[PDB]
Amino acid sequence: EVQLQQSGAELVKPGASVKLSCTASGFNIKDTYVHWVKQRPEQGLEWIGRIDPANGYTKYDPKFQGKATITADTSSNTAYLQLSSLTSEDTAVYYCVRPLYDYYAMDYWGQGTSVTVSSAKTTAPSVYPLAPVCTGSSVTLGCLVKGYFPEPVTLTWNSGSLSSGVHTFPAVLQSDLYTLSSSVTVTSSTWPSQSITCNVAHPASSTKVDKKIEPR
Amino acid sequence: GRGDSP
Amino acid sequence: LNLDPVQLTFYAGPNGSQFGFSLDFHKDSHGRVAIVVGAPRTLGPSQEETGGVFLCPWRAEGGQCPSLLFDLRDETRNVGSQTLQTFKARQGLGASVVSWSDVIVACAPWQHWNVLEKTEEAEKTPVGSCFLAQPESGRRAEYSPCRGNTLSRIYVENDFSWDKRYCEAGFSSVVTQAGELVLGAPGGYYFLGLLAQAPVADIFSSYRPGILLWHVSSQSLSFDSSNPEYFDGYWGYSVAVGEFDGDLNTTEYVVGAPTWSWTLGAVEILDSYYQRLHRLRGEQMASYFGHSVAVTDVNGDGRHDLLVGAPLYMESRADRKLAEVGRVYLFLQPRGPHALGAPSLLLTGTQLYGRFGSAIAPLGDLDRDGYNDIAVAAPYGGPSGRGQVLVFLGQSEGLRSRPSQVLDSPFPTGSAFGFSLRGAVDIDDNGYPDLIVGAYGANQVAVYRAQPVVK
Amino acid sequence: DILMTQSPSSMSVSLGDTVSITCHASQGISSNIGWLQQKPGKSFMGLIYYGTNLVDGVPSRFSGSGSGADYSLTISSLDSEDFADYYCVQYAQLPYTFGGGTKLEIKRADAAPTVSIFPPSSEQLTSGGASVVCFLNNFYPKDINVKWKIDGSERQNGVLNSWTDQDSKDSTYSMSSTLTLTKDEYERHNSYTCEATHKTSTSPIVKSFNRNEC
Amino acid sequence: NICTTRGVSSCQQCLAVSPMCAWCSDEALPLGSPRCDLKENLLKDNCAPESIEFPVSEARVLEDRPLSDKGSGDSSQVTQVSPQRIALRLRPDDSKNFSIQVRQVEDYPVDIYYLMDLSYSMKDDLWSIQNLGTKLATQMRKLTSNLRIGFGAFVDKPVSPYMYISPPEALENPCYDMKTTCLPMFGYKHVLTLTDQVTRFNEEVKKQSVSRNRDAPEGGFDAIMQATVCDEKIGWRNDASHLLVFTTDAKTHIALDGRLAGIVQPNDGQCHVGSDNHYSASTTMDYPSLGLMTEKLSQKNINLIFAVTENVVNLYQNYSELIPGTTVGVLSMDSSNVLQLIVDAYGKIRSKVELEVRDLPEELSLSFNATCLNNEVIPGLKSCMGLKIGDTVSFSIEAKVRGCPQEKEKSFTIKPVGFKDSLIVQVTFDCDCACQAQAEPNSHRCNNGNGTFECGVCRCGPGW
Ligand SMILES: *[C@@H]1O[C@H](CO)[C@@H](O[C@@H]2O[C@H](CO)[C@@H](O[C@@H]3O[C@H](CO[C@H]4O[C@H](CO)[C@@H](O)[C@H](O)[C@@H]4O)[C@@H](O)[C@H](O[C@H]4O[C@H](CO)[C@@H](O)[C@H](O)[C@@H]4O)[C@@H]3O)[C@H](O)[C@H]2NC(C)=O)[C@H](O)[C@H]1NC(C)=O
Ligand SMILES: *[C@@H]1O[C@H](CO)[C@@H](O[C@@H]2O[C@H](CO)[C@@H](O)[C@H](O)[C@H]2NC(C)=O)[C@H](O)[C@H]1NC(C)=O
Ligand SMILES: *[C@@H]1O[C@H](CO)[C@@H](O)[C@H](O)[C@H]1NC(C)=O
Ligand SMILES: [Ca+2]
Ligand SMILES: [Ca+2]
Ligand SMILES: [Ca+2]
Ligand SMILES: [Ca+2]
Ligand SMILES: [Mn+2]
Ligand SMILES: [Mn+2]
Ligand SMILES: [Mn+2]
Incomplete structure (x- = not known):
């Protein structure tokens, strides 16, 4: 079965150089063309270029000329993509692609490689409890993980005990630092009667702080 | 080389 | 010995179509035997020769045959900033045909191909192509493994290495029992010659009309060479398969290369990975040793034997004079892991310019004595030079040195009677294997039915 | 570069529905188009290539069509898995170009x-x-x-x-x-x-x- | 002796016993005297001299023209074989001897047709034909006073894949894809008919230029065939040595190669060079086989010379051996001389004298004793070697008849290979008696009309 194992996520600083890999499984990389594709949330999908691993000849979208450099080693059965003089706009998920039958198609895709460019040094998150204001039938509490880097962070309530009836929002880059929040809803008879604790873990800084939600 | 070449 | 020469069956095609240039037997899903016939100069849609194929049902009285229709229109695809082009004019569709299971493979060795990119091109060249058909289901597929999208300049820079632009894929063809198609391309790699193989099943499942350039991952091509001994050797001019290494899980290939080593000629036996197990060198320069090759066990020891034709071999005669008559070589396979020695038998032609050995067909066991027999063609032999087929019977020691029977051409001069042969198949279901003989010059096929032995 | 105007950007539908996404090119591309699928939080999967041809292992409810500069991916009888992002891509010319994308949301x-x-x-x-x-x-x-x-x-x-x-x-x-x-x-x-x-x-x-x- | 102990019945049977047997038709022969005995025994028994039937195997000449000293001048009245005709008379199981003389005449006319490879690879070999006409007339002037020279060119069959067929410009200029220009591709073209005007050769050559094709092997064999079978066009002369000089730097195509161009029709050995001086079957007919080429070269009496570069010398040396009478010269920039090569080739050509027999009856068998160099006899040999032009050799011949054939009048020829002249041997089988041409059918002497009286005895008439 055709599979493209791309290298793990990369986290580098602006101006540095990174080199992604795309190892072929269940076939010889030399068999077909190998393309690279950049993906961003707002900008979308952009074709970087391709390479014919057999002979080494390449083609690029003139937008990436100079920035991107695609190579391939038939020995290790792997194709590479090097990006130089990195910037914020280079922050994207990169995919290696190859056709199924049609020489010129784009059918098989690797799982993708996430690349993040930032100077931000590893920073532990500041967790904050969010209790309501001084009534209804159901109450809603919250947690606020502010100022941390890099991602990700696993947030849970009561150490996983409370699962259903929860909302954890996607992190957002607050100027070279991430911010995240999570809500939670229960009945008025559950709080503050039943104690509720916010459990956040940041593997990077090796810190796992917990804050109990206190009423006002 | 293998063709019609001087 | 026991082929009935009194009551023949004749199939005929359009004039000037070269109907009978190639042929084979074909069994449908129900085992009903038919004859497939190639006519590589049949007119196409634009009243231009493109070749064609016919599927003839067995009828004791023969006659005309229905066509096996294929797409004959030129194709163009503008993709990847390039332009892909196929040219089927004078492609010679049906220059070879072979049947495996309920599938028919008809090849067009001189179908041309080209790729355009702005002001550059790959060069319009004969890469050849094969058309696969499943008559009952109507399924159609193609296989053109020498097509490429590399521009002319690139080859020049690389000293013309791995140049498959003149392959002429389908020149010769064979299919293994397992269902792997094997195509001889004598023009491959700048006229060294190459083999291309791929499972018929995979050829079908990966093909789609319009694409023109698609991948068949499971395919396997032979290799280029820097050795001048291989230059202009036309490796793949003829091909066959068989068992020559003991291991029954492996299939071995037999490739003829009639101009190998400065026209000395040779035939090689290889494994499925194209590794040479044996090489048989020609006896005489320009004899075209390797023009045709047959694989069959003739001495009933269970081991496949090799037969090689050299249609232009010149026999030595009185007063230091040579007479071109043609020759066939028999190589018997030895017990266990051993090399094929000298030929066990030399069969030489009699008629001058007769081209004895141009075609060699296994007949199976014609007289039912326990040994397989063969037929050898001399397309311009016989006292009248109209053509002749000679039957030689197998025996414990190999083959009989004298023919048990001689079929003289029922056609007029120039019919090339015998240029193509096929046997070992009982077409009338009478218990004896039968012979079909092509005569493209006369645009006809003759069917010889084997009958119970008289003696 | 060839522009690929893919619409609609999104649509809200239910299970069992038959929906069709469209793709307009800035010029003719003679069926040299491919359709891709990206299930949320996952990589891409090939659906169609060269206009109408299904990639191996793709349900037949998917189908591609169209010619010239206009093409359409159609999904008959929507399935719970089919709710995802879909993109078109042309390889008629270099550089290859993609469509804006289309998210299938539940209604x-x-x-x-x-x-x-x-x-x-x-x-x-x-x-x-x-x-x-x-x-x-x-x-x-x-x-x-x-x-x-x-x-x-x-x-x-x-x-x-x-x-x-x-x-x-x-x-x-x-x-x-x-x-x-x-x-x-x-x-x-x-x-x-x-x-x-x-x-x-x-x-x-x-x-x-x-x-x-x- | 055997003559008597054989107990023969007729005069015919008597002579058939042995060449030394005689028969007596004398009427007044003693009681029990054997009519079949030695001529000495018969005369010893008072046998009439005229009644003796005793044939003798002779061999007198009829035409005995003297060998020519100079092959120059004359309207081809040159003689290089002597005698030219002899009458041979034999009797059953007998044999007679005769001799023949062959001379490699001095100053014999010579045709030289130059068949020139003009494919692109021949760019760096063109030096050899530069001033050919003159340089080819100089070192020849000293072996012949009557030289004619002609010129032809070839590339290969103008058809894919041999020929480049794209882009459209490639057809008019095969060097289009490069920085240069060259001629459209052609198979074979006749350029200059055999002539004595050498400056015609020089000026024609100066207008020649190379073409270009795809595959290394070239179609020179097509050209060799046409240059051979197109007699009137090339201009070969009836009484002259024919030299066909073949120049190339590469391998050559051969019969059955044409199938890569879709050409399967065998070469027909006929002429196909029309008014336009081009080979018209080039693209519809396969290359000729060595066998076919040999047949025509022998028929038209052409001596093929392979003047090739040293990178393929071995190849053509090997072909040379499959086409008897062919010679090879190394076309280099160093040697005895690269294009006196032709003179040396000629010398090699006229350095052998091999006899050949045509129309020899089944009954007759011949033996030969050659006399070469200096009266050196070499038994069982009918060829000579290491001869110079002007040299003369001879052969002793013995015809041994076996039994007595049905036809009494037969004749065969003994000709040297390549030579115009030949020795005609008119054989006569004498196994009858003159007295047989005066018999008595239904004679009164023989069983009273039931027999025939001839040669003294009584034979059983026809029907018994
Ligand atoms: C023109 O024609 C000539 C003459 O036929 C060819 O020259 C021959 O080339 C072949 C193939 O290369 C040679 O065959 C080899 O002979 C070797 C030696 O045996 C004899 O020859 C040499 C002279 O070279 C003598 O010194 C020696 O005493 C012998 O008399 C063998 O050792 C070789 O065996 C190898 O190959 C065989 C077959 O594959 C294997 O079985 C062996 O194990 C081994 O690998 C081989 O048989 C032959 O010697 C050459 N003959 C002569 C007289 O030179 C030219 O090739 C040909 N040229 C062209 C371009 O057509
Ligand atoms: C060819 O030469 C041989 C000798 O090599 C001759 O043979 C001899 O012929 C004479 C004739 O008188 C006999 O007496 C000898 O007995 C023969 N010798 C041998 C050894 O056979 C022969 O005569 C010559 N033949 C021709 C055609 O002249
Ligand atoms: C035959 O041979 C003898 C010598 O044995 C020779 O003297 C004689 O001249 C020869 N006969 C002829 C006719 O040449
Ligand atoms: Ca095997
Ligand atoms: Ca056997
Ligand atoms: Ca048998
Ligand atoms: Ca039968
Ligand atoms: Mn050349
Ligand atoms: Mn050269
Ligand atoms: Mn050539």
């Missing part, structure tokens, strides 16, 4: 958002910062607007919003808005508000609170 009955405002924490304030959070949970459709106000007047600087992907078993969306100020600036004012505007209600849902008061 359901409208629903107003459960707004909830939260003043800064004691910890954060003592640190020197002040963040007011405003959760707008479980609402449909996804189109919604949040507006902060300090002492009745709009505030736009220092706001960070974040949305969620359509929840699994209730098919609703949620949102998180966060107004971040300095401790000092936070104390210059008393009232704080976040107004939610949704097609559900013509008048915006409002939730406020007063500093130095409970």
Whole structure:
């Protein structure tokens, strides 16, 4: 079965150089063309270029000329993509692609490689409890993980005990630092009667702080 | 080389 | 010995179509035997020769045959900033045909191909192509493994290495029992010659009309060479398969290369990975040793034997004079892991310019004595030079040195009677294997039915 | 470069429906088009190539069509897995170009958002910062607007919003808005508000609170 | 002796016993005297001299023209074989001897047709034909006073894949894709008919230029065939040595190669060079086989010379051996001389004298004793070697008849290979008696009409 194992996520600083890999499984990389594709949330999908691993000849979208450099080693059965003089706009998920039958198609895709460019040094998150204001039938509490880097962070309530009836929002880059929040809803008879604790873990800084939600 | 070449 | 020469069956095609240039037997899903016939100069849609194929049902009285229709229109695809082009004019569709299971493979060795990119091109060249058909289901597929999208300049820079632009894929063809198609391309790699193989099943499942350039991952091509001994050797001019290494899980290939080593000629036996197990060198320069090759066990020891034709071999005669008559070589396979020695038998032609050995067909066991027999063609032999087929019977020691029977051409001069042969198949279901003989010059096929032995 | 105008950008449909996405090119591309699928939080999968040809292992309910500069991917009888992002790609010319993309979202009955405002924490304030959070949970459709106000007047600087992907078993969306100020600036004012505007209600849902008061 | 102990019945049977047997038709022969005995025994028994039937195997000449000293001048009245005709008379199981003389005449006319490879690879070999006409007339002037020279050119069959067929410009200029220009591709073209005007050769050559094709092997064999079978066009002369000089730097195509161009029709050995001086079957007919080429070269009496570069010398040396009478010269920039090569080739050509027999009856068998160099006899040999022009050799011949054939009048030829002249041997089988031409059918002497009286005895008439 055709599979493209791309290298793990990369986290580098602006101006540095990174080199992604795309190892072929269940076939010889030399068999077909190998393309690279950049993906961003707002900008979308952009074709970087391709390479014919057999002979080494390449083609690029003139937008990436100079920035991107695609190579391939038939020995290790792997194709590479090097990006130089990195910037914020280079922050994207990169995919290696190859056709199924049609020489010129784009059918098989690797799982993708996430690349993040930032100077931000590893920073532990500041967790904050969010209790309501001084009534209804159901109450809603919250947690606020502010100022941390890099991602990700696993947030849970009561150490996983409370699962259903929860909302954890996607992190957002607050100027070279991430911010995240999570809500939670229960009945008025559950709080503050039943104690509720916010459990956040940041593997990077090796810190796992917990804050109990206190009423006002 | 293998063709019609001087 | 026991082929009935009194009551023949004749199939005929359009004039000037070269109907009978190639042929084979074909069994449908129900085992009903038919004859497939190639006519590589049949007119196409634009009243231009493109070749064609016919599927003839067995009828004791023969006659005309229905066509096996294929797409004959030129194709163009503008993709990847390039332009892909196929040219089927004078492609010679049906220059070879072979049947495996309920599938028919008809090849067009001189179908041309080209790729355009702005002001550059790959060069319009004969890469050849094969058309696969499943008559009952109507399924159609193609296989053109020498097509490429590399521009002319690139080859020049690389000293013309791995140049498959003149392959002429389908020149010769064979299919293994397992269902792997094997195509001889004598023009491959700048006229060294190459083999291309791929499972018929995979050829079908990966093909789609319009694409023109698609991948068949499971395919396997032979290799280029820097050795001048291989230059202009036309490796793949003829091909066959068989068992020559003991291991029954492996299939071995037999490739003829009639101009190998400065026209000395040779035939090689290889494994499925194209590794040479044996090489048989020609006896005489320009004899075209390797023009045709047959694989069959003739001495009933269970081991496949090799037969090689050299249609232009010149026999030595009185007063230091040579007479071109043609020759066939028999190589018997030895017990266990051993090399094929000298030929066990030399069969030489009699008629001058007769081209004895141009075609060699296994007949199976014609007289039912326990040994397989063969037929050898001399397309311009016989006292009248109209053509002749000679039957030689197998025996414990190999083959009989004298023919048990001689079929003289029922056609007029120039019919090339015998240029193509096929046997070992009982077409009338009478218990004896039968012979079909092509005569493209006369645009006809003759069917010889084997009958119970008289003696 | 060839431009690929892929529409619609999104559509809300239910299971068993038959929907068709379209793709317009800036010029002719003679069926040299491919269709891709990207299930949420996963990589891509080939659907169609060269116009109409299904990639191996793809359900037959998918089908491609069209010619010239206009093409369409059609999914007959939608399945729960089929709710994902779809893109078109042309390889008629280099460089290859993709479409904008199309997200297949689940359809359901409208629903107003459960707004909830939260003043800064004691910890954060003592640190020197002040963040007011405003959760707008479980609402449909996804189109919604949040507006902060300090002492009745709009505030736009220092706001960070974040949305969620359509929840699994209730098919609703949620949102998180966060107004971040300095401790000092936070104390210059008393009232704080976040107004939610949704097609559900013509008048915006409002939730406020007063500093130095409970 | 055997003559008597055989107990023969007729005069015919008597002579058939042995060449030394005689028969007596005398009427007045003693009681029991054997009519079949030695001529000495018969005369010893008072046998009439005229009644003796005793044939003798002779061998007198009829035409005995003297060998020519100079092959120059004359309207081809040159003689290089002597005698030219002899009458041979034999009797049953007998044999007679005769001799023949062959001379490699001095100053014999010579045709030289130059068949020139003009494919692109021949760019760096063109130096050899530069001033050919003159340089080819100089070192030849000293072996012949009557030289004619002609010129032809070839590339290969103008058809894919041999020929480049794209872009359209490639057809008019095969060097289009390069920085240069060259001639459209052609198979074979006749350029200059055999002539004595050498400056015609020089000026024609100066207008020649190379073409270009795809595959290394070239179609020179097509040209060799046409240059051979297009007699009137090339201009070969009836009484002159024919030299066909073949120049190339590469391998050559051969019969059955044409199938790569879709050409399967065998070469027909006929002429196909029309008024336009081009080979018209080039693209519809396969290359000729060595066998076919040999047949025509022998028929038209052409001596093929392979003047090739040293990178393929071995190849053509090997072909040379499959086409008897062919010679090879190394076409280099160093040697005895690269294009006196032709003179040396000629010398090699006229350095052998091999006899050949045509129309020899089944009954007759011949033996030969050669006399070469200096009266050196070499038994069982009918060829000579290491001869110079002007040299003369001879052969002793013995015809041994076996039994007595049905036809009494037969004749065969003994000709040297390549030579115009030949020795005609008119054989006569004498196994009858003159007295047989005066018999008595239904004679009164023989069983009273039931027999025939001839040669003295009584034979059983026809029907018994
Ligand atoms: C023109 O024609 C000539 C003459 O036929 C060819 O020259 C021959 O080339 C072949 C193939 O290369 C040679 O065959 C080899 O002979 C070797 C030696 O045996 C004899 O020859 C040499 C002279 O070279 C003598 O010194 C020696 O005493 C012998 O008399 C063998 O050792 C070789 O065996 C190898 O190959 C065989 C077959 O594959 C294997 O079985 C062996 O194990 C081994 O690998 C081989 O048989 C032959 O010697 C050459 N003959 C002569 C007289 O030179 C030219 O090739 C040909 N040229 C062209 C371009 O057509
Ligand atoms: C060819 O030469 C041989 C000798 O090599 C001759 O043979 C001899 O012929 C004479 C004739 O008188 C006999 O007496 C000898 O007995 C023969 N010798 C041998 C050894 O056979 C022969 O005569 C010559 N033949 C021709 C045609 O002249
Ligand atoms: C035959 O041979 C003898 C010598 O044995 C020779 O003297 C004689 O001249 C020869 N006969 C003829 C006719 O040449
Ligand atoms: Ca095997
Ligand atoms: Ca056997
Ligand atoms: Ca048998
Ligand atoms: Ca039968
Ligand atoms: Mn050349
Ligand atoms: Mn050269
Ligand atoms: Mn050539």
